Design a protein around this ligand. Structure first.
Ligand SMILES: [Mn+2]
Length: 339
């Protein structure tokens, strides 16, 4: 399969050509579940410098890597075999980068759950990831303005929710295959708004396009998990490593807001014959923002983002020191107070 590739304008203004481009992006998601966006030389350089920083860090001993954790934020290191998909432990090691807030930030002083400084392994890694995430965020904002325009919505519909958004990134290393087992991460959908993915030259990501007649679960609802669904049935598209692109697909919150006009793209990762580096960037609402259905005016359903994120991470990392401190200090009470 050959994915569609688009060049984004540096600024999105709402002109008729922006609307036409936004419609094309929507159509590509509706047909293929994903598309490529071309990177310029600086976007590409920052991508490769982030991957190199990841490779260096992963070569450190586990004793050091394990120390890169915080009891205030979920940012930092997750060893291989700690995450689980459809009840089966997954293979990659992960460094998650959430908003990097100093202890002087008023949200950290107030003890809001999940708010705190990233436990960076070193300053060179910090700089590489921050620079990369700066570019990824500018692309995310362009994409969300184009998506709104394509649906004939106010240009600001999504970006109003993503001001100081809770953007975060999974910095991943998958091991080489070491047995007959090759499921690096099982089939799932991502819980957030918009996903921008980058990878090295190795290969291993597969995505599922929309399928006529196929029922899709609403993974934000209890009892409608998308985990494991379709894992052993076609169609799955291999996301071929390609120089000079990132890929982009919708998450669960875009499926919710669009009432299923966009579907959260199912994806899975196969272990390759050598290690694979990748980054998955989530462009998200503000922690205090609530997503809402755009095309169902009288629907009362909402997704309060900070509640959604906090509950997800507490369930996914239930023994992490971050979760223990939330429980010990009753930090979920702050969430109720904010709402
Ligand atoms: Mn994912």
């Amino acid at each position: 399969t050959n994915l569609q590739t688009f060049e984004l304008p540096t600024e999105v203004t709402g002109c008729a050509a922006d609307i036409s481009l936004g419609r094309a992006l929507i159509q590509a998601w509706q047909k293929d579940g994903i598309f490529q966006i071309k990177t310029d030389s600086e976007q590409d350089r920052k991508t490769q410098e982030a991957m190199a920083a990841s490779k260096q860090f992963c070569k450190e001993p586990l004793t050091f890597k394990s120390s890169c954790v915080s009891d205030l934020t979920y940012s930092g290191y997750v060893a291989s075999g700690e995450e689980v998909t459809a009840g089966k432990p997954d293979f990659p090691e992960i460094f998650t980068v959430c908003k990097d807030l100093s202890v002087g930030d008023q949200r950290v002083k107030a003890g809001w759950p999940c708010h705190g400084p990233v436990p960076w392994p070193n300053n060179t890694y910090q700089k590489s990831m921050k620079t990369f995430m700066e570019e990824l965020g500018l692309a995310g904002e362009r994409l969300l303005k184009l998506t709104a325009l394509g649906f004939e919505l106010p240009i600001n519909t999504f970006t109003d929710l993503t001001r100081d958004g809770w953007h975060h990134m999974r910095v991943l290393r998958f091991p080489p295959q070491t047995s007959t087992l090759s499921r690096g991460i099982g089939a799932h959908t991502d819980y957030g708004l918009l996903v921008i993915a980058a990878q090295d030259d190795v290969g291993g990501l597969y995505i599922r396009p929309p399928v006529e007649g196929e029922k899709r679960n609403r993974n934000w609802l209890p009892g409608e998990s998308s985990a494991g669904m379709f894992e052993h049935d076609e169609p799955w598209t291999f996301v071929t490593p390609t120089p000079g692109v990132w890929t982009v697909f919708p998450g669960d919150i875009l499926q919710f807001m669009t009432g299923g006009q966009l579907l959260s793209t199912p994806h899975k990762v196969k272990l390759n014959t050598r290690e694979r580096f990748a980054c998955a960037y989530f462009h998200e609402p503000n922690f205090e923002a609530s997503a809402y259905p755009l095309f169902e005016p009288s629907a009362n359903e909402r997704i309060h983002y900070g509640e959604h994120f906090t509950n997800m991470f507490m369930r996914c990392y239930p023994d992490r020191i971050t979760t223990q401190r939330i429980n010990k200090e009753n930090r979920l009470a702050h969430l109720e107070d904010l709402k």
